[PDB]
Amino acid sequence: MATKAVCVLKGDGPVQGIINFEQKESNGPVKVWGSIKGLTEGLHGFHVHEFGDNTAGCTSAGPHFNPLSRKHGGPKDEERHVGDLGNVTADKDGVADVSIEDSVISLSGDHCIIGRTLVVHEKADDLGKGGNEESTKTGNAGSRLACGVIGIAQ
Amino acid sequence: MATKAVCVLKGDGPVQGIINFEQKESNGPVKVWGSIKGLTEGLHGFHVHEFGDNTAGCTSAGPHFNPLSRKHGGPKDEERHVGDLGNVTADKDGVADVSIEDSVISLSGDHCIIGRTLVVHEKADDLGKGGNEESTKTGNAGSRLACGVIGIAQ
Ligand SMILES: OCCCCCCCC[C@H](O)CO
Ligand SMILES: OCCCCCCCC[C@H](O)CO
Ligand SMILES: OCCCCCCCC[C@H](O)CO
Ligand SMILES: [Zn+2]
Numbered sequence: 094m095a096t097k098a099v100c101v102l103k104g105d106g107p108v109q110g111i112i113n114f115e116q117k118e119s120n121g122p123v124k125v126w127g128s129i130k131g132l133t134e135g136l137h138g139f140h141v142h143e144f145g146d147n148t149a150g151c152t153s154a155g156p157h158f159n160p161l162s163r164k165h166g167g168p169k170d171e172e173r174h175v176g177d178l179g180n181v182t183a184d185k186d187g188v189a190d191v192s193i194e195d196s197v198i199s200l201s202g203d204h205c206i207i208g209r210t211l212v213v214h215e216k217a218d219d220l221g222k223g224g225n226e227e228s229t230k231t232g233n234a235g236s237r238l239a240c241g242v243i244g245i246a247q
Numbered sequence: 248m249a250t251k252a253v254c255v256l257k258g259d260g261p262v263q264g265i266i267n268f269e270q271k272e273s274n275g276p277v278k279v280w281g282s283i284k285g286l287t288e289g290l291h292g293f294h295v296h297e298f299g300d301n302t303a304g305c306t307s308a309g310p311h312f313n314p315l316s317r318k319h320g321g322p323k324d325e326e327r328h329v330g331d332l333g334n335v336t337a338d339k340d341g342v343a344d345v346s347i348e349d350s351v352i353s354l355s356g357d358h359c360i361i362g363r364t365l366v367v368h369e370k371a372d373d374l375g376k377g378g379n380e381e382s383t384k385t386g387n388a389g390s391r392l393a394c395g396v397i398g399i400a401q
């Protein structure tokens with residue numbers, strides 16, 4: 094179905110960016126790329142949350158998109174949430190030049206992420222290996238710095 | 248599959264609101280309701296535009312969602328864009344208490360509006376009866392006051 098999507102990330106602080114999605118083949122991987130600025134240098138959790146609901150800020154996006162009811166993992170684990178895209182890295186200028194390819198999210202079908210929320214988080218995603226309960230839910234990535242609803246793009 | 252959706256409308260000016268969508272059956276109408284404030288009193292065109300793309304503000308949402316390549320109409324017309332939801336009315340306090348039921352838009356299938364952009368416009372939508380070229384495209388509803396990407400709601 095849909096082959097391109099886009100997300101404008103905004104929040105209460107300086108974090109903002111534009112993230113593109115492209116899926117040339119409905120049964121193939123999604124390319125995810127763009128630039129997020131205003132970030133502290135280092136790793137930031139980067140997840141699709143379940144609801145494209147921004148009525149109370151990023152909070153109402155709910156938890157990670159998890160249609161298979163699995164535990165949080167890194168994108169390369171079999172045990173992952175569908176929304177588990179891992180970390181993005183911001184450089185010393187505060188910019189994350191995102192470049193991710195993922196074969197679990199989709200722009201169509203039951204793993205469709207259109208109309209859900211992309212969130213860039215305060216802290217690193219421990220990829221579910223943090224040894225606490227929070228690790229298996231959010232990877233301890235902390236608060237939601239910026240988010241946007243993922244929309245169909247031209 | 249999706250039975251509820253939500254949209255947060257923001258723009259460069261004071262217009263803002265929250266619009267809810269509910270479709271209990273996929274073969275059935277979508278209820279559209281909520282409140283938009285900061286509007287001038289009177290009629291305002293209220294349309295789903297094609298792209299859930301807010302990268303350059305409301306302008307990048309593209310034209311009215313129109314997968315059947317029809318001319319613009321009011322919601323009651325057989326000739327209408329899928330995104331043609333007519334006018335909403337703002338009271339003397341600047342508030343549009345939206346209450347619409349439509350069976351052309353859907354929260355699934357070909358006519359799915361999740362991941363697309365809801366826009367409230369400057370002027371009245373002439374429902375395609377204005378007799379100029381613009382009426383058959385936008386209803387002469389004028390600029391985009393506020394918009395948001397339609398997202399899956401809990
Ligand atoms: O993806 C490449 C450009 C992304 C960086 C642009 C900063 C954010 C601009 C606004 O949020 C978009 O309305
Ligand atoms: O939605 C109920 C009213 C529909 C009729 C709106 C007429 C707008 C005419 C304006 O002068 C167009 O330039
Ligand atoms: O867009 C065209 C449909 C609405 C046309 C209604 C015009 C109202 C005329 C009245 O005489 C105003 O005093
Ligand atoms: Zn997760």
Ligand SMILES: [Zn+2]
Nearest residue numbers: 311319328331
């Ligand atoms: Zn139209």
